């Protein structure tokens, strides 16, 4: 599998979440929970060039 973190904001202090499987992320991201998108980024490695969930293609991973 492949988990994907998600941050509501784009700051270095903002809340850091998204330790769920791409499957769980796709649900929330697809369900519509994020109407504006979130700072999505693979958990490992920790801390990288984050990317908006709306700019990622989970379909090319699951």
């Amino acid at each position: 599998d492949v988990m994907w973190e998600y941050k509501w904001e784009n700051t270095g202090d903002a809340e850091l979440y998204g330790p769920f499987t791409s499957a769980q992320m796709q649900t929330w991201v697809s369900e519509g929970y994020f109407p504006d998108g979130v700072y999505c980024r693979k958990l490992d490695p920790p801390g990288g060039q984050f990317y908006n969930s709306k700019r990622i293609d989970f379909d090319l991973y699951t």
Binding site: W8, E15, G18, T27, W28, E31, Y33
Partner: peptide, 11 residues
């Protein structure tokens, strides 16, 4: 199928 509320939120 269903799922719980994601972290962070704001209420």
């Amino acid at each position: 199928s269903h799922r719980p509320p994601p972290p962070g939120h704001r209420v």
